[PDB]
Amino acid sequence: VEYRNWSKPQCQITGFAPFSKDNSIRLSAGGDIWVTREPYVSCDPVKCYQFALGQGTTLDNKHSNDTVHDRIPHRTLLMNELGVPFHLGTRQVCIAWSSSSCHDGKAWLHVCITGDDKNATASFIYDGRLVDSIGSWSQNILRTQESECVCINGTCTVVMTDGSASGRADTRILFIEEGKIVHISPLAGSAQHVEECSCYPRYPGVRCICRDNWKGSNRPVVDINMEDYSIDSSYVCSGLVGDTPRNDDRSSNSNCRDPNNERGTQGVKGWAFDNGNDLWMGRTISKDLRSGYETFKVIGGWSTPNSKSQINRQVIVDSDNRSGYSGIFSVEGKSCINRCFYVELIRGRKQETRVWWTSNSIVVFCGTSGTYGTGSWPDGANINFMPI
Ligand SMILES: *[C@@H]1O[C@H](CO)[C@@H](O[C@@H]2O[C@H](CO)[C@@H](O[C@@H]3O[C@H](CO[C@H]4O[C@H](CO)[C@@H](O)[C@H](O)[C@@H]4O)[C@@H](O)[C@H](O[C@H]4O[C@H](CO)[C@@H](O)[C@H](O)[C@@H]4O)[C@@H]3O)[C@H](O)[C@H]2NC(C)=O)[C@H](O)[C@H]1NC(C)=O
Ligand SMILES: CC(=O)N[C@H]1[C@H]([C@H](O)[C@H](O)CO)O[C@H](P(=O)(O)O)C[C@@H]1O
Ligand SMILES: *[C@@H]1O[C@H](CO)[C@@H](O)[C@H](O)[C@H]1NC(C)=O
Ligand SMILES: *[C@@H]1O[C@H](CO)[C@@H](O)[C@H](O)[C@H]1NC(C)=O
Ligand SMILES: *[C@@H]1O[C@H](CO)[C@@H](O)[C@H](O)[C@H]1NC(C)=O
Ligand SMILES: [Ca+2]
């Protein structure tokens, strides 16, 4: 077996088609399913897997109480073949309250982060063994992507950040070969806050669309040159804008260079990808809450500042239903490399108070160059039937 180099043109896509759904919450009311959050999907050269950060407990378990908290020592990274829900036979790959995994064509790489907030540690697990580790450099919650990393020719990139959640932070891009950190580049360019990057290969580089939790409702971009380790960053040009909270398609802007300062605080992990001068993107339908989910193409959303000409829209989750994080994953086809995405459907505590736990399910779509129809695919569980 040889290393993945992802050197195939990006497939032309018409939109996205239904791919997978796990119905975990619906199943949690009549079975032993893990309580999770921050899921993602990634594929090796033969098949795809679904990942998620568990909460060290099943749902119909008193231990599910107050699982709104994000960082506890019992969080582990779960990994199952795409489509099989997180039941008791699931493998906990490592201890992690924040993670990222990707396959280089020869073996899996998992970057798992646990520990105290002020002194977390990230373990780099490659081919089943712990190969390296690094400690917090800013003493303030070392965190990573919450989606897949990408490898070209045997070198994998993962962006990480340590520092303020709503203030200046220290973001770096590590390069790792066979689990070993061979280089670290600090962030450069004009992005002001970078978190939860959704990266994809763009031979010979890697491009990431991230979360600005400080000053922007528009999304930062991070360009990584695999050849010399040089970084560059900006914000997506699209005047449509993909963070939540955000302004209003009417009063939202982006100049491609700086955080727009329009309801900048907070956000949600999301994605987007360029296609010539256009941009394919996805976001919650609601501008205030993590509700509904839609995707569309923005004519010129990549190259022209504040472009708002939308086309090819699709509703993935109707606006009366809950959504959450979303990220991207790439899959190698016979002649081109395709782009797909998953969307986390959060249920429970925070918005829903009948129960005491917080967990999620997922639904995933893959681009298509063919035809498609219409629909809506939400979680599906009736909160009134749920335990707790
Ligand atoms: C973030 O995480 C890191 C990594 O885990 C922590 O660093 C470790 O901190 C511990 C505690 O200080 C270190 O272990 C201790 O080493 C001491 C020796 O080092 C000092 O003294 C020698 C003297 O020759 C100097 O050369 C050296 O420079 C140091 O000044 C031991 O004496 C310690 O044992 C004694 O104290 C402990 C409690 O601390 C008692 O329980 C023991 O009984 C004993 O009395 C201990 O072995 C460790 O070496 C550090 N690791 C590294 C790699 O540096 C950070 O502290 C942590 N930061 C925060 C804020 O949490
Ligand atoms: C490592 C970590 O705790 N990540 C958490 C992030 C993080 O708090 C923000 O990105 C601010 O940096 O928040 C999300 P959410 O609260 O948006 O739902 C839950 C995550 O577990
Ligand atoms: C990428 O890998 C394939 C299959 O190994 C190989 O044929 C191709 O030449 C490689 N291309 C580049 C640019 O690395
Ligand atoms: C990948 O490897 C092939 C063969 O070594 C090389 O020609 C190509 O330029 C490399 N690409 C990158 C991005 O390193
Ligand atoms: C969850 O915890 C709170 C106190 O922390 C308690 O009042 C509540 O009843 C618990 N939920 C259940 C279902 O026991
Ligand atoms: Ca924001």
Coordinates of C-alpha atoms and ligand atoms in Angstrom, one line a residue:
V1 CA 0.0 0.0 0.0
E2 CA 1.2 3.5 -0.8
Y3 CA 0.4 6.9 0.6
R4 CA -2.6 9.1 -0.4
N5 CA -1.7 12.2 -2.3
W6 CA -5.2 13.3 -3.3
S7 CA -4.1 14.5 -6.7
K8 CA -7.3 14.2 -8.7
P9 CA -9.5 17.1 -9.7
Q10 CA -12.5 18.0 -7.5
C11 CA -15.7 16.4 -8.9
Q12 CA -18.2 18.8 -10.4
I13 CA -21.2 18.8 -8.2
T14 CA -24.9 19.6 -8.7
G15 CA -25.7 19.6 -5.0
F16 CA -25.7 16.8 -2.4
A17 CA -27.6 13.5 -2.1
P18 CA -28.6 11.5 1.0
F19 CA -25.9 9.2 2.3
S20 CA -26.3 8.0 5.9
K21 CA -28.2 8.5 9.2
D22 CA -27.8 6.7 12.5
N23 CA -31.0 7.4 14.4
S24 CA -29.1 7.1 17.7
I25 CA -31.5 9.2 19.9
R26 CA -34.6 7.3 18.7
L27 CA -32.7 4.1 19.4
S28 CA -31.6 5.4 22.9
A29 CA -35.1 5.0 24.2
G30 CA -35.0 1.3 23.7
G31 CA -31.4 0.2 23.8
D32 CA -27.9 1.0 25.3
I33 CA -26.5 3.7 23.2
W34 CA -23.7 6.1 24.1
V35 CA -24.2 9.8 24.9
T36 CA -22.0 11.8 22.6
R37 CA -21.4 15.2 20.9
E38 CA -18.9 16.6 18.4
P39 CA -19.1 13.8 15.8
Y40 CA -17.5 13.6 12.4
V41 CA -16.8 11.1 9.6
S42 CA -13.7 10.1 7.9
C43 CA -12.8 7.3 5.4
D44 CA -9.8 5.2 4.7
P45 CA -9.3 4.0 1.1
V46 CA -11.9 1.3 1.5
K47 CA -14.7 2.4 3.8
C48 CA -16.0 5.2 6.0
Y49 CA -16.3 5.5 9.8
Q50 CA -18.3 7.7 12.2
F51 CA -16.5 9.2 15.2
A52 CA -17.7 11.1 18.2
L53 CA -16.6 12.1 21.7
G54 CA -18.5 10.0 24.2
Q55 CA -19.4 11.0 27.7
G56 CA -18.4 7.8 29.4
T57 CA -22.0 6.7 29.8
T58 CA -25.0 5.4 27.9
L59 CA -28.2 7.5 27.7
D60 CA -30.5 5.4 29.8
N61 CA -28.0 5.7 32.7
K62 CA -28.1 8.0 35.8
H63 CA -24.6 9.1 34.7
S64 CA -26.1 10.9 31.7
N65 CA -27.3 13.6 34.0
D66 CA -25.8 17.0 33.4
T67 CA -23.8 15.8 30.4
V68 CA -24.0 19.4 29.0
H69 CA -20.4 19.8 30.2
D70 CA -17.8 19.6 27.5
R71 CA -14.7 18.5 29.2
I72 CA -14.6 15.6 31.7
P73 CA -11.9 12.9 32.1
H74 CA -14.3 10.3 31.0
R75 CA -14.7 11.5 27.4
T76 CA -13.2 9.1 24.9
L77 CA -13.1 9.1 21.1
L78 CA -15.6 6.5 19.6
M79 CA -15.1 5.0 16.2
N80 CA -17.6 2.7 14.3
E81 CA -18.1 1.9 10.7
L82 CA -20.4 4.6 9.2
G83 CA -24.0 3.5 9.8
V84 CA -23.6 1.4 12.9
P85 CA -24.8 3.4 16.0
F86 CA -22.7 3.8 19.1
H87 CA -23.7 0.7 21.1
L88 CA -21.7 -1.1 23.9
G89 CA -19.4 -2.9 21.5
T90 CA -18.0 0.3 20.2
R91 CA -14.2 0.9 20.5
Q92 CA -13.0 3.9 22.6
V93 CA -9.9 4.7 20.5
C94 CA -8.3 7.1 23.1
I95 CA -9.0 9.5 25.9
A96 CA -10.2 12.8 24.3
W97 CA -12.4 15.8 25.0
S98 CA -11.4 17.3 21.7
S99 CA -10.1 15.3 18.6
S100 CA -9.2 14.8 15.0
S101 CA -8.4 11.7 12.9
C102 CA -7.4 11.0 9.3
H103 CA -5.9 8.1 7.4
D104 CA -2.7 8.6 5.3
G105 CA -3.4 5.6 3.1
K106 CA -1.4 3.2 5.3
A107 CA -2.8 3.8 8.8
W108 CA -5.0 5.9 11.1
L109 CA -3.8 9.0 13.0
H110 CA -5.8 10.2 16.0
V111 CA -4.9 13.4 17.8
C112 CA -6.6 13.1 21.2
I113 CA -6.6 15.9 23.9
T114 CA -7.5 15.5 27.6
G115 CA -6.4 16.9 30.9
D116 CA -6.8 20.1 32.9
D117 CA -7.9 23.1 31.0
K118 CA -4.8 25.0 32.0
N119 CA -2.5 22.1 31.2
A120 CA -4.1 19.7 28.7
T121 CA -1.9 17.3 26.7
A122 CA -2.4 16.0 23.1
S123 CA -1.4 12.4 22.3
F124 CA -0.6 11.4 18.7
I125 CA -1.7 7.9 18.1
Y126 CA -0.6 6.3 14.8
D127 CA -1.1 2.8 13.7
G128 CA -2.3 1.8 17.1
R129 CA 0.6 3.0 19.2
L130 CA 1.3 6.3 21.0
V131 CA 4.0 8.0 18.9
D132 CA 4.2 11.5 20.3
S133 CA 2.6 14.1 22.6
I134 CA 2.6 17.9 23.2
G135 CA 1.4 20.0 26.1
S136 CA -0.6 23.2 26.3
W137 CA 1.4 26.3 25.1
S138 CA -1.1 28.9 26.3
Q139 CA -2.5 27.3 29.4
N140 CA -6.0 27.8 28.3
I141 CA -7.8 24.8 26.8
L142 CA -5.7 23.2 24.0
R143 CA -8.3 22.3 21.4
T144 CA -8.5 21.0 17.8
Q145 CA -10.7 20.4 14.7
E146 CA -13.5 18.1 15.8
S147 CA -13.4 16.7 12.2
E148 CA -10.9 15.0 9.9
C149 CA -7.3 16.0 9.4
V150 CA -5.6 15.6 5.9
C151 CA -2.5 13.8 4.7
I152 CA -0.6 14.3 1.5
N153 CA 2.3 12.0 0.6
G154 CA 2.6 10.7 4.2
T155 CA 2.5 14.1 6.0
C156 CA -0.7 15.0 7.9
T157 CA -1.9 18.4 9.0
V158 CA -4.0 19.4 11.9
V159 CA -4.7 22.9 13.2
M160 CA -4.8 23.5 16.9
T161 CA -5.4 26.5 19.1
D162 CA -4.8 27.4 22.7
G163 CA -5.9 30.6 24.3
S164 CA -8.9 32.8 24.7
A165 CA -12.3 31.7 23.4
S166 CA -13.3 35.3 22.8
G167 CA -10.0 37.2 22.6
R168 CA -6.6 36.8 21.0
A169 CA -5.5 33.1 20.9
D170 CA -2.5 31.1 19.7
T171 CA -3.2 29.0 16.7
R172 CA -0.6 26.6 15.2
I173 CA -0.4 24.1 12.4
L174 CA 1.4 20.8 13.2
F175 CA 2.8 18.6 10.5
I176 CA 3.1 14.9 11.4
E177 CA 4.7 12.0 9.7
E178 CA 3.8 8.5 11.1
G179 CA 2.6 10.0 14.4
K180 CA 5.7 12.2 14.8
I181 CA 5.5 16.0 14.9
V182 CA 8.0 17.0 12.2
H183 CA 7.1 20.7 12.2
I184 CA 4.9 23.4 13.7
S185 CA 4.0 26.7 11.9
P186 CA 2.2 29.5 13.7
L187 CA -0.9 31.0 12.1
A188 CA -0.4 33.8 9.6
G189 CA -2.5 36.0 7.3
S190 CA -5.5 38.0 8.4
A191 CA -7.7 35.6 10.4
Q192 CA -8.4 37.0 13.9
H193 CA -9.7 33.8 15.7
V194 CA -9.5 30.3 14.4
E195 CA -11.2 27.3 15.9
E196 CA -12.7 24.0 14.8
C197 CA -11.4 23.9 11.3
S198 CA -13.0 21.9 8.6
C199 CA -10.1 21.0 6.2
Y200 CA -10.0 19.3 2.8
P201 CA -7.2 18.5 0.3
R202 CA -6.7 20.8 -2.6
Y203 CA -3.5 19.3 -4.1
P204 CA -0.9 20.4 -3.4
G205 CA -2.3 22.1 -0.3
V206 CA -4.9 21.8 2.3
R207 CA -7.7 24.5 2.8
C208 CA -9.7 24.9 6.0
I209 CA -12.8 26.9 6.8
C210 CA -13.1 27.5 10.5
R211 CA -14.9 29.2 13.4
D212 CA -14.3 32.7 14.6
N213 CA -15.7 32.8 18.1
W214 CA -14.5 36.4 18.8
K215 CA -15.2 39.0 16.2
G216 CA -16.7 37.4 13.1
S217 CA -20.0 35.8 11.9
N218 CA -18.1 35.3 8.6
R219 CA -15.8 32.2 8.5
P220 CA -12.0 32.3 8.5
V221 CA -10.0 30.5 5.9
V222 CA -6.7 28.8 6.5
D223 CA -4.3 27.9 3.6
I224 CA -1.6 25.4 4.3
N225 CA 1.3 24.9 1.9
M226 CA 2.4 21.3 2.3
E227 CA 5.6 22.1 0.5
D228 CA 7.2 24.7 2.7
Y229 CA 4.8 24.8 5.7
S230 CA 3.8 28.4 5.0
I231 CA 0.3 29.4 6.2
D232 CA -2.1 32.1 5.1
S233 CA -5.5 33.1 6.3
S234 CA -8.5 35.3 5.4
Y235 CA -12.4 35.1 5.7
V236 CA -14.7 33.7 3.1
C237 CA -15.8 36.4 0.6
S238 CA -19.4 35.5 0.5
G239 CA -21.8 38.1 1.8
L240 CA -24.1 35.3 2.8
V241 CA -22.0 34.1 5.8
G242 CA -22.0 30.8 7.6
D243 CA -21.6 31.3 11.3
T244 CA -24.3 31.2 14.0
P245 CA -25.2 33.7 15.4
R246 CA -25.1 36.0 12.3
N247 CA -26.8 39.1 11.0
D248 CA -29.4 38.6 8.3
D249 CA -28.9 38.0 4.6
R250 CA -30.0 41.6 4.3
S251 CA -27.6 43.2 6.7
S252 CA -24.7 40.8 6.6
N253 CA -21.3 41.5 5.0
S254 CA -17.8 40.1 4.5
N255 CA -14.9 41.8 2.8
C256 CA -12.8 38.6 2.5
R257 CA -10.2 40.1 4.8
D258 CA -11.4 40.9 8.3
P259 CA -13.9 39.7 10.9
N260 CA -17.2 41.4 10.0
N261 CA -18.0 42.4 13.6
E262 CA -21.6 41.5 13.0
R263 CA -22.7 39.4 16.0
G264 CA -19.1 38.0 16.1
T265 CA -19.1 36.3 19.5
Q266 CA -19.6 32.6 19.6
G267 CA -20.3 30.5 16.6
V268 CA -20.5 26.9 15.5
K269 CA -18.3 24.5 13.7
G270 CA -19.1 24.6 10.0
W271 CA -17.7 24.2 6.5
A272 CA -17.5 25.4 2.9
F273 CA -15.5 24.7 -0.2
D274 CA -14.5 26.6 -3.3
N275 CA -15.4 25.8 -6.9
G276 CA -13.6 28.2 -9.2
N277 CA -15.0 31.6 -8.1
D278 CA -18.1 30.1 -6.5
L279 CA -18.6 28.6 -3.1
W280 CA -20.6 25.6 -1.8
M281 CA -21.6 26.2 1.8
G282 CA -23.9 25.0 4.5
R283 CA -25.3 26.6 7.7
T284 CA -28.2 26.5 10.2
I285 CA -31.4 28.0 8.8
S286 CA -31.8 30.1 12.0
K287 CA -29.5 33.1 12.5
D288 CA -29.8 32.9 16.2
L289 CA -30.0 29.3 17.2
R290 CA -28.6 26.0 16.0
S291 CA -31.8 25.0 14.2
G292 CA -32.5 23.7 10.7
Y293 CA -29.7 23.2 8.1
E294 CA -29.4 24.3 4.4
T295 CA -26.8 24.2 1.7
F296 CA -26.5 26.3 -1.5
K297 CA -24.0 27.7 -4.0
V298 CA -23.1 31.3 -3.9
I299 CA -22.2 32.6 -7.4
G300 CA -18.8 34.3 -6.8
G301 CA -18.9 33.5 -3.1
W302 CA -15.2 32.6 -3.2
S303 CA -13.7 35.4 -5.3
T304 CA -16.0 38.4 -4.9
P305 CA -16.4 40.4 -1.7
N306 CA -19.9 40.4 -0.3
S307 CA -21.4 38.4 -3.2
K308 CA -25.0 37.2 -2.3
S309 CA -26.3 35.6 -5.5
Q310 CA -27.5 32.2 -4.2
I311 CA -28.5 29.1 -6.3
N312 CA -29.0 25.3 -5.9
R313 CA -30.3 25.5 -2.4
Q314 CA -31.3 22.4 -0.4
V315 CA -32.9 22.0 3.0
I316 CA -31.2 19.2 4.9
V317 CA -33.0 19.8 8.2
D318 CA -36.2 21.9 8.3
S319 CA -36.1 25.0 10.5
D320 CA -38.4 23.6 13.1
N321 CA -35.8 21.0 14.0
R322 CA -32.5 21.1 15.9
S323 CA -29.1 20.8 14.1
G324 CA -25.6 21.6 15.5
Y325 CA -22.1 21.2 14.3
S326 CA -21.3 20.2 10.7
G327 CA -18.0 19.5 9.0
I328 CA -16.6 18.2 5.7
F329 CA -14.9 15.0 4.6
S330 CA -13.4 14.1 1.2
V331 CA -13.6 10.7 -0.6
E332 CA -11.5 9.6 -3.5
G333 CA -13.4 8.6 -6.6
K334 CA -12.3 6.9 -9.8
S335 CA -11.6 10.2 -11.6
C336 CA -12.1 13.0 -9.1
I337 CA -12.2 13.7 -5.4
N338 CA -15.7 14.2 -3.9
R339 CA -16.8 16.3 -0.9
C340 CA -19.3 15.3 1.6
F341 CA -20.6 16.5 5.0
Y342 CA -22.3 15.4 8.1
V343 CA -24.5 17.3 10.5
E344 CA -24.8 16.8 14.2
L345 CA -28.4 16.8 15.5
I346 CA -28.2 17.8 19.1
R347 CA -31.1 16.9 21.5
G348 CA -31.6 17.4 25.1
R349 CA -30.4 19.8 27.7
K350 CA -29.8 23.4 26.9
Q351 CA -32.8 23.8 24.6
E352 CA -34.8 20.8 25.7
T353 CA -35.5 20.7 29.5
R354 CA -37.7 17.7 29.9
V355 CA -34.6 15.5 30.1
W356 CA -31.3 16.0 32.0
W357 CA -28.8 14.7 29.4
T358 CA -27.3 16.2 26.2
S359 CA -26.5 14.0 23.2
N360 CA -26.8 13.9 19.4
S361 CA -27.4 11.8 16.2
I362 CA -26.1 12.5 12.7
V363 CA -27.2 12.6 9.1
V364 CA -24.7 12.7 6.2
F365 CA -24.8 13.7 2.5
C366 CA -22.4 13.5 -0.3
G367 CA -22.1 15.7 -3.3
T368 CA -23.4 14.4 -6.6
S369 CA -23.1 15.4 -10.2
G370 CA -26.5 13.8 -10.8
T371 CA -30.0 14.8 -10.0
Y372 CA -32.0 14.9 -6.8
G373 CA -35.2 15.8 -5.1
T374 CA -36.3 17.3 -1.8
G375 CA -36.8 16.4 1.8
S376 CA -35.9 17.0 5.5
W377 CA -34.0 14.5 7.7
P378 CA -34.0 15.5 11.4
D379 CA -33.1 13.5 14.5
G380 CA -36.6 12.0 14.8
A381 CA -36.9 11.3 18.5
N382 CA -39.9 12.4 20.6
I383 CA -38.6 14.0 23.6
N384 CA -41.6 12.8 25.5
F385 CA -40.7 9.1 25.0
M386 CA -37.1 9.7 26.1
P387 CA -35.7 8.5 29.5
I388 CA -35.0 11.0 32.2
Ligands
LIG1 C1 1.8 21.3 33.7 O1 2.3 19.9 33.5 C2 3.7 19.7 33.7 C3 4.0 18.3 33.3 O2 3.3 17.3 34.0 C4 4.0 20.0 35.1 O3 5.4 19.8 35.3 C5 5.9 18.8 36.2 O4 5.7 19.4 37.5 C6 6.2 18.5 38.6 C7 5.9 19.2 39.9 O5 6.7 20.3 40.0 C8 7.6 18.1 38.3 O6 7.9 17.0 39.2 C9 8.6 17.3 40.4 O7 10.0 17.5 40.1 C10 10.7 18.1 41.2 C11 12.1 18.4 40.8 O8 12.3 19.5 39.9 C12 12.7 20.8 40.5 O9 13.9 20.6 41.3 C13 15.0 20.2 40.7 C14 16.2 20.0 41.7 O10 17.3 19.4 41.1 C15 15.4 21.2 39.5 O11 16.5 20.7 38.8 C16 14.2 21.4 38.6 O12 14.6 22.4 37.7 C17 13.0 21.8 39.4 O13 13.2 23.1 39.9 C18 10.5 17.0 42.4 O14 11.2 17.5 43.6 C19 9.0 16.8 42.7 O15 8.9 15.9 43.8 C20 8.6 16.6 45.0 O16 7.4 17.3 44.9 C21 6.1 16.5 44.7 C22 5.0 17.5 44.4 O17 5.4 18.5 43.5 C23 5.9 15.6 45.9 O18 4.8 14.8 45.8 C24 7.2 14.7 46.0 O19 7.0 13.9 47.2 C25 8.5 15.5 46.1 O20 8.6 16.1 47.4 C26 8.4 16.2 41.4 O21 9.0 15.0 41.0 C27 7.9 17.6 36.9 O22 9.3 17.3 36.7 C28 7.3 18.5 36.0 N1 7.6 18.0 34.7 C29 8.4 18.5 33.7 C30 8.5 17.8 32.5 O23 8.9 19.6 33.9 C31 3.6 21.4 35.5 O24 3.7 21.7 36.8 C32 2.1 21.6 35.1 N2 1.8 23.0 35.4 C33 0.7 23.4 36.1 C34 0.4 24.8 36.4 O25 -0.2 22.6 36.4
LIG2 C1 -12.5 22.0 23.8 C2 -13.9 22.5 24.0 O1 -14.3 22.7 25.2 N1 -14.7 22.8 23.0 C3 -16.0 23.2 23.2 C4 -16.3 24.5 22.4 C5 -15.5 25.7 22.9 O2 -16.1 25.9 24.2 C6 -15.7 26.9 22.1 O3 -15.1 26.7 20.8 C7 -15.0 28.1 22.6 O4 -13.5 28.1 22.4 O5 -17.7 24.8 22.5 C8 -18.6 23.9 22.0 P1 -20.2 24.7 22.1 O6 -20.3 25.2 23.4 O7 -20.1 25.8 21.0 O8 -21.4 24.0 22.0 C9 -18.5 22.6 22.9 C10 -17.0 22.1 22.8 O9 -16.7 21.0 23.5
LIG3 C1 -0.5 10.2 -6.7 O1 -0.6 8.8 -6.4 C2 -0.9 8.0 -7.6 C3 -1.2 6.6 -7.1 O2 -0.1 6.2 -6.3 C4 0.2 8.1 -8.6 O3 -0.1 7.4 -9.8 C5 0.3 9.6 -8.9 O4 1.3 9.8 -9.9 C6 0.6 10.5 -7.7 N1 0.7 11.8 -8.1 C7 1.3 12.8 -7.5 C8 1.3 14.2 -8.1 O5 1.9 12.6 -6.4
LIG4 C1 3.8 14.2 -3.6 O1 4.8 13.2 -4.0 C2 5.1 13.2 -5.4 C3 6.2 12.1 -5.6 O2 7.2 12.4 -4.6 C4 5.7 14.6 -5.9 O3 6.1 14.6 -7.2 C5 4.6 15.7 -5.5 O4 4.9 17.0 -5.9 C6 4.4 15.6 -4.0 N1 3.4 16.6 -3.6 C7 3.4 17.3 -2.4 C8 2.3 18.3 -2.2 O5 4.3 17.1 -1.6
LIG5 C1 -29.9 15.4 37.9 O1 -29.2 16.1 38.9 C2 -30.0 17.1 39.7 C3 -29.0 17.6 40.7 O2 -27.7 17.7 40.2 C4 -31.2 16.4 40.3 O3 -32.1 17.4 41.0 C5 -32.0 15.7 39.2 O4 -33.1 15.1 39.8 C6 -31.1 14.8 38.5 N1 -31.9 14.1 37.5 C7 -32.5 12.9 37.7 C8 -33.3 12.4 36.6 O5 -32.3 12.3 38.8
CA6 CA -18.6 33.9 15.5

